[PDB]
Amino acid sequence: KLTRTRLDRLYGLPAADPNNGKEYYEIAGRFSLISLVPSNDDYQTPIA
Amino acid sequence: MASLIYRQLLTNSYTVDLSDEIQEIGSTKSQNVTINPGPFAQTGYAPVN
């Protein structure tokens, strides 16, 4: 509920302030990345 | 003697090594070739749309 207005029961974030006197937002996770790499060709080296 | 001179020609082989190392040291560059693999895997990129 907003006050002194006609719109009521906000469902979501307005554009006023999410800072709220706090510092950050934290999200945890783990990647699973598959890609192509050229940096493990260990044969083209000089003799001895 | 002529045969003795022939054996003398056979004896003095301790100079060919000096001669060809003289040739080598004044010769051109040296080099080192490298190593290569064998067969492969034949891969690609299937799920593209």
Side-chain angles (χ1 to χ4, degrees):
Chain A
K1 294 293 191 292
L2 213 65
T3 182
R4 195 167 290 153
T5 48
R6 282 282 312 97
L7 276 296
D8 64 308
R9 286 277 185 255
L10 306 157
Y11 315 120
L13 270 296
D17 51 334
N19 194 309
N20 303 325
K22 68 181 178 67
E23 182 65 26
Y24 286 118
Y25 276 122
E26 291 325 326
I27 309 99
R30 172 157 301 126
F31 292 165
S32 42
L33 177 64
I34 192 67
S35 194
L36 183 63
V37 60
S39 67
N40 62 8
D41 296 331
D42 56 356
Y43 292 167
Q44 47 262 24
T45 61
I47 292 303
Chain B
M1 187 66 204
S3 307
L4 278 296
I5 288 312
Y6 181 76
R7 77 160 181 78
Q8 183 267 334
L9 183 63
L10 187 147
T11 51
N12 298 115
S13 179
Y14 63 71
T15 68
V16 172
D17 43 359
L18 294 174
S19 192
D20 63 358
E21 62 86 20
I22 294 302
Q23 275 313 116
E24 192 295 349
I25 193 66
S27 66
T28 177
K29 54 162 281 313
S30 300
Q31 188 270 334
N32 266 292
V33 176
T34 182
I35 297 89
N36 301 115
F40 289 103
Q42 296 272 335
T43 190
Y45 46 95
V48 62
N49 188 338

